[PDB]
Design an enzyme around this catalytic site. Structure first.
Site, PDB file in Angstrom:
ATOM      1  N   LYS A 115       0.811  -1.202   0.000  1.00  0.00           N
ATOM      2  CA  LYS A 115       0.000   0.000   0.000  1.00  0.00           C
ATOM      3  C   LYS A 115       0.850   1.261   0.000  1.00  0.00           C
ATOM      4  N   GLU A 199      -1.505  13.255   8.797  1.00  0.00           N
ATOM      5  CA  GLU A 199      -2.092  13.280   7.476  1.00  0.00           C
ATOM      6  C   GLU A 199      -3.394  14.037   7.506  1.00  0.00           C
ATOM      7  OE1 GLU A 199      -2.349   8.512   7.694  1.00  0.00           O
ATOM      8  OE2 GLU A 199      -3.426   9.305   5.936  1.00  0.00           O
ATOM      9  N   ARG A 291      -6.358  -6.180 -11.176  1.00  0.00           N
ATOM     10  CA  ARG A 291      -7.231  -7.289 -11.538  1.00  0.00           C
ATOM     11  C   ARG A 291      -8.529  -6.623 -11.992  1.00  0.00           C
ATOM     12  NH1 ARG A 291     -11.109  -6.993  -7.652  1.00  0.00           N
ATOM     13  NH2 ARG A 291     -10.489  -6.427  -5.508  1.00  0.00           N
TER      14      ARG A 291
END
Lengths: 451, 451
Positions: A115, A199, A291
């Site tokens: 990630k 963040e 995918r």
């Protein structure tokens, strides 16, 4: 073009891939577990093999699957979604044995599986990521200036400890200073290091994702976006394409950026960039799925591009014929996941067997499913019975078509999400286009329906 | 917009109409017989009433249906296709009691129910017709004379006709005179009017039909054409849109002519003009249907116009928003009729009950059906189980998509046309586009299949 393709999956996605293969003239191989000797995907394929020592090992033993592909002459494998589709070792093993994996290169699967690396990769390509500190904050002075620069509210968390001590939310600089001191000391006490990370906090956000498709020659296009905000337990329930949030200017802006990043990582096959979005249409990358996704059909309805068939064509070496200005977004499409689960009991799976089963059909209606009377919902596999997909030129007509299709979809023998989905289609906020990832929390009246 | 509409039909066309109504927000009323207490169309409807003293009295007793409409407050009646849809007495009665009949005006239904008058209407508009008698024959001598003038082989048709009865082919005047009394007598038997027409007999024709749609203010458009050549004993089995015969120029020419005729008679709602085409590809009008047709979905797929919904809107007085240059023809669509009948035994109906039932779905697939496990094929009603409809950008992919959909459509408990349809999809002549109304006679190998 491949002569034979092995589909390393089950259920509706296995049937979707088999149909694409049949239309292309390709022979298909299904795999299954003995507990599903009767599966729909087994009956649709030209040949089918039971492998595996338990219902999940069937689809998760990469070495067994690749040897079967070799044994039966399958030149390629489609992994579907879930199971091994984002398993870099499966894909590498296919390549190491001379079988084409229908998907991006195994190096890309590996890169975008982490990630953090994937966020860094995207930051360097120009795609917006959630702003915050670049790693550990030097001190509270840097915290104050980074926060001021990225805009309150902001989040603080310890760098150590995997979240054993939680997050703190700060809505102004006073709260930030206090939260910094407290998180620092709690982290010293709990982990012996006070270092913190910061963040921007995206409150009440939407889930917006962009679809990309690239061939092996570097021609990469996007196919617009999907709004998947209506979800439960980070489980999508309703997906729409395009979003109602973005303008055409904003769609092509964010779209060409994801195209650039994909071109820079050598992406080909199908992939998706998931973003969180605010009220104004600001998007921040969160992750990439390397995918096909469950909800790919809503994008197919508005663009007319057969994504799964293009995967196979791309893996066989065809060029992606279109260019970005051939892609048009026509009308609106909604997908509803019809799951065998009980929304009034925590979306617990309703295990049992389908008795009455009537699938709706009509103008602008598409159904992806592998179900019939007697299909058995087991605890070993996901609870999806069917994906109900609708297309219409106007947003309100799509909503009405979906409501009307759901209201005629008869399934008995198990609880399903249908009554809930009907209430969502009837809800004023949903019809107005006003929904975020907290929609369900915020609209408990949609759980009011009678036994 | 109507608040409530009564659907005077059953099976898949009733569900089709109910769905259009649900999408428009209109309450629906179903009618049914005691043998159909669990039919799909009654479950889909907001209200349903058991009427009729036998399975046919339910749908053919115009007096009962209109009174029930009044009893229950239905403002309008949709007749479907079959039963009373082209019964001018039904339509008149609706009008005389204040119920809107969803269809053309009853005087038009009556006018166009006679093959001679319909042909004169078309002649007067400039629509090409088959050379023959100036309306109805006065007697056999006028027939022997006109036949001499147009050249054998010649055809006799019942003017009040419908289907194969009252029709005879004459290769010489010897055959013609016996055939004149035989056809006259058969026409009295079947329709109560012996009135015959003569025209010139076109061997090996293709069946090409144009769709029109007009509002009650005189805006009439066409939606192009359908090739329905692949049929048996006046029962269409496979229908495609557009035809492969016509160029875009021919489609707009013949289309504007049937639009002209329709305007000349004040046509509104949906209707179809049927043509035969000769060896050289010239078209000749033969009859008009003043109703929705079974195979309307293929025209909806290539134009995006929802014909049944526009029928309802038109009946309520809406203006038809489109003009002729708004209508485009995008791709190809194939419809196959999935009937409970045995093609190897003369298409005899397969009486029984559906056991296994899996409906295929996917990109470019539409299914119109009213069936589930346990649906009963009875001798009282037609043998249609489902209409399978596909769309594709190219003719060959449409064929592959239909073949692949058929190969996965599982139905047991009755014989069906599915094995025959798959062979047709694999047949080279079909794939190449070479088929006439004689296709089946000329391709007996498609009847060779297992079980």
């Amino acid at each position: 073009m491949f002569k034979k393709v092995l589909v390393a999956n089950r259920g509706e996605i296995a049937c979707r891939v088999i149909r694409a293969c049949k239309e292309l003239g390709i022979q298909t191989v299904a795999i299954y577990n003995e507990i599903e000797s009767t599966a729909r995907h087994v009956k649709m394929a030209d040949e089918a093999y039971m492998i595996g020592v338990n219902p999940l090992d069937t689809y998760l033993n990469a070495e067994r699957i690749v040897d079967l592909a070799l044994e039966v002459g399958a030149e390629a494998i489609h992994p579907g979604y879930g199971f091994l589709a984002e398993n870099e070792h499966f894909a590498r093993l296919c390549e190491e044995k001379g079988i084409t994996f229908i998907g991006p290169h195994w190096k890309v699967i590996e890169l975008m599986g982490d990630k953090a690396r994937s966020k860094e990769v995207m930051k360097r390509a120009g795609v917006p990521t959630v702003p915050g500190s670049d790693g550990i904050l030097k001190d509270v002075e840097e915290a104050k200036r980074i926060a001021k620069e990225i805009g309150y509210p902001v989040l603080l968390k310890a760098s150590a400890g995997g979240g054993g001590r939680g997050i703190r939310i700060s809505r102004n600089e006073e709260e930030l200073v206090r939260n910094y001191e407290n998180a620092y000391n709690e982290a010293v006490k709990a982990f012996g290091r006070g270092d913190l990370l910061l963040e921007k906090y995206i409150e009440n956000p939407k889930h917006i994702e962009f679809q990309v498709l690239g061939d092996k020659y570097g021609n990469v296009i996007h196919l617009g976006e999907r709004d998947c905000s209506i979800q439960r337990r980070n489980q999508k329930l309703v997906e729409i394409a395009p979003s109602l949030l973005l303008t055409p200017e904003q769609r092509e802006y964010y779209g060409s950026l994801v195209v650039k990043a994909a071109k820079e990582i050598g992406y080909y096959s199908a992939g998706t960039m998931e973003f969180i979005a605010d009220e104004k249409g600001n998007l921040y990358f969160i992750e990439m799925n390397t995918r096909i996704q469950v909800e790919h059909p809503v994008t197919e309805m508005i663009t007319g591009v057969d994504i799964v068939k293009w995967q196979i064509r791309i893996a066989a070496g065809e060029r992606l014929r279109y260019s970005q200005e051939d892609i048009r977004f026509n009308g609106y499409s909604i997908e509803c996941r019809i799951n065998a689960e009980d929304p009034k009991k925590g979306f617990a799976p309703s295990i049992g067997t389908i008795e009455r089963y009537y699938v709706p059909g009509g103008f602008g209606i598409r159904v992806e499913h592998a179900s019939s009377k007697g299909y058995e919902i087991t605890p070993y596999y996901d609870s999806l019975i069917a994906k109900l997909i609708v297309w219409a030129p106007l947003w309100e007509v799509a909503v009405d078509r979906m409501r009307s299709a759901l209201e005629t979809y008869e399934i008995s023998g198990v609880k399903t999400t249908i009554p809930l989905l009907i209430n969502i289609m009837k809800d004023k906020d949903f019809r107005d286009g006003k929904f975020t990832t907290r929609y369900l929390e915020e609209h408990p009246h949609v759980f009011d329906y009678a036994e």
